[PDB]
């Protein structure tokens, strides 16, 4: 048992390990989406930038949880990073919709993590989730909801003009 | 025989001369396209700039091959620069499509040049083609493929609004 | 078939996809090693930095291959990123030894990739491997060999004083 | 008929097209001379610079006529650019003599162009020729006459010392 | 066997050792030529500078090969550096002619080294030769060919005025 | 006989030539030692720097004697530069010990050179040896004696920790 471990339940430690894996997967999904829009038959270079940056952000969210696990005296256990769901996301509107879906599932996982730490009476792990992840998730979901709404109101996915102009004006 | 000539085959020298002519022709084609979009009944001033700059670049690729020929001890032999294929490229989408076609043919010529220097065992001429021309070609073809894709997805050539907006936002 | 695809063999495309996965795995291995040395019962903060930086570098090597695949007209196919080999690398000397081993295996894969592109007569893909990956690998392997040698000559792994001083003076 | 065309005779338009071709040819001749003096058995690097710069200038004179043609509502028609007259201009004195000859022929063409625009009563095209081409030609011919005179008085072409010193002091 | 050695053939290692010796010899030859022109009965101080700088460059080419040998896991074996061929190179034109000859022989050795690495399937050692030595050699030979041509056309070696003026204007 | 030669004995001239060769050899020995410590199984990068810098210094001592020989009207005669004594100097302590030995032998040669110039009554050559070489030698020998003493008192050659720490703190 770790010399720094205090008030840190075996269940929280396992949950933190499952959340690290989820953030890595989210990083992988965004990396996959990014280079979809870099294809010559898609060619939306700011969608690609937007998702490459989201990819780098999610791996920084994972690294922070790895830091928290060592901080609290638990042991990181890594699992396979599953290959993403799709190889061909049709359109810019479909990608933002998958991203919105993915960000809600991550949020749901974080809310369950917070409920477990409330019940294990771990106030430090609670504040960590609140301070670094919960408001980030709410802001990400609101941003992606906005993007999805603009893309629909513009006429996407059937109008490539709409998707082209959204690339230049919102994401550029 | 030249005092600096070493490991430089008569066939490579002829091939370099044929490649100089191809680059000049490519320069001429782009010059012709540039001033098509400067016509008052076409009036896309950034298409014209894009192609004038490509015109100047191709003549700088030709000058570099002339420098290489003197560097290796061969003798430059110049041929007529053929007048380009078209006087009226219909639309911006049609010009990028001809440019994509032209850039692939130049690439194909460069790949054949590289195969001949491999077989004549001229590693310096191989590295020269690799370092200065091969990745340039791959980047040019990918750029033009992107432009062609955006123009189609926007509704060109039937939508002059699409071509107008591409001029302002991608090429400006 | 892609409008930009030229002289790009189905076998090279598959090989590039297998190399992207290998670089991601290497990135994952280094990320795992990094946070091993961040544990409170290991506590070598510059080993952790050294490997976190190597982790970020390998994912940038992967992103470049994804860019090359789109550049040449192939299609990225992603596989699961396997969880790394170990959860507990004993010592700093053992980690540098695994890293040396991993970097040789990546090199071997790159040399086989280069042999396949030579035989498919793809000089652009050859120069890409030479210019961006081959000398990087040779420099990485020489660096890790040096680290392993210093750690042994100092008295590692049995001397934690040796490992402590190497952390401060070579990696800091 | 062009919406901007006014007082612009079919004969002037054809003459402008023939002058564009002449300027391109002049650009090609100078490019050919430039890389003659870059040969290792000629090796006069400032003759080469002098003629490379004249080459770039003549293509800028051609581009200006293409701009004028679009400005006035005519249609550019491009012809083959004939390969230059010589592959081996013997000496620096012989090249300046060919350049002097070429510049007089261009001047003669410009004077005939000006006579046709006088007779077609096109005062704008007259002023354009006067303001941008006529004094340029007179200055070029006087410069080349000076160079030819100095080279002869120095002892060229039989004295390579003379040609060497002219390269360093007048053209450097 | 070295812990970093990978795909590095015993024959390449021996060839690299023979090339290190050749570069040192070339450094010695240039050092010898340099201080010939520093003699009071020769007294061409810029020939001396030109060759002293070439001397320092060749030893830096040797040091780079020593670095490559350690990089790849081979073992440097040094041989005697033979005293140069001449003690009295007659004239500036004769020295540039020996230097031209020496630089072609070094090039020939490098081309044979590249052929051996092609046949041993060592693409890293191939790119190293291409990237650091092959174009350097081509540029050196072209420079020395130019110098030799100017010196002859000026009237060297019988005209010490020619050699004096070349010292001041080309090499100063 | 040289127009600048004055009070310069045939014996001094020969001795200066033998000293030039000794300095070149010393330069070669240090170059050899430098790249010993650059080996991956030795890996002491500051020993390597220390000896590479000493290598460059000794060749600058040789160049100064070549300058002196021309200054006085003698004729430089170069001999083979013998390959160094060892290919594998065991340890850092053993290299500093060979370097100490080599520097004393060079000093002894310089003292004999000074004795010959005293007896040939060449006060200029005496002051040259005193002003540029004699105090340099005394300072080099004292420095190397210090290094050897520290390395022994630290526990070298049996302690690679000692050699590692000396590399970082004294030579870095
Ligand atoms: Ca799976
Ligand atoms: Ca024709
Ligand atoms: Ca698994
Ligand atoms: Ca290459
Ligand atoms: Ca013709
Ligand atoms: Ca007027
Ligand atoms: Ca000998
Ligand atoms: Ca010997
Ligand atoms: Fe996000
Ligand atoms: Fe996240
Ligand atoms: Fe281009
Ligand atoms: Fe080109
Ligand atoms: Fe690495
Ligand atoms: Fe990598
Ligand atoms: Fe001109
Ligand atoms: Fe002109
Ligand atoms: Fe050189
Ligand atoms: Fe060299
Ligand atoms: Fe010294
Ligand atoms: Fe010395």
Swiss-Prot record, chains A, B, C, D, E, F:
Transmembrane spans: none
Main location: cytoplasm
Binding site for Fe cation 1: 23, 58, 61
UniProt binding sites for Fe cation 2: 58, 103, 137
Ferritin-like diiron domain residues: 6-155
Keywords on record: Acetylation, Cytoplasm, Cytoplasmic vesicle, Iron, Iron storage, Lysosome, Metal-binding, Neurodegeneration, Oxidoreductase, Phosphoprotein
UniProt key word Disulfide bond: no
GO MF annotations, alphabetized: ferric iron binding; ferrous iron binding; ferroxidase activity; identical protein binding; iron ion binding; iron ion sequestering activity
Compartments in which it is found: Cytoplasm; Lysosome; Cytoplasmic vesicle, Autophagosome
Gene Ontology process terms (BP): immune response; intracellular iron ion homeostasis; iron ion transport; negative regulation of cell population proliferation; negative regulation of ferroptosis; negative regulation of fibroblast proliferation
Annotated InterPro entries: Ferritin (IPR001519), Ferritin-like (IPR012347), Ferritin-like_diiron (IPR009040), Ferritin-like_SF (IPR009078), Ferritin_CS (IPR014034), Ferritin_DPS_dom (IPR008331)
Pfam families named among the record's database cross-references: Ferritin
Family stated for the protein in its record: Belongs to the ferritin family.
Role noted for this protein: Stores iron in a soluble, non-toxic, readily available form. Important for iron homeostasis. Has ferroxidase activity. Iron is taken up in the ferrous form and deposited as ferric hydroxides after oxidation. Also plays a role in delivery of iron to cells. Mediates iron uptake in capsule cells of the developing kidney. Delivery to lysosomes is mediated by the cargo receptor NCOA4 for autophagic degradation and release of iron.
Protein name: Ferritin heavy chain
Biological source species: Homo sapiens
Gene, per the UniProt record: FTH1
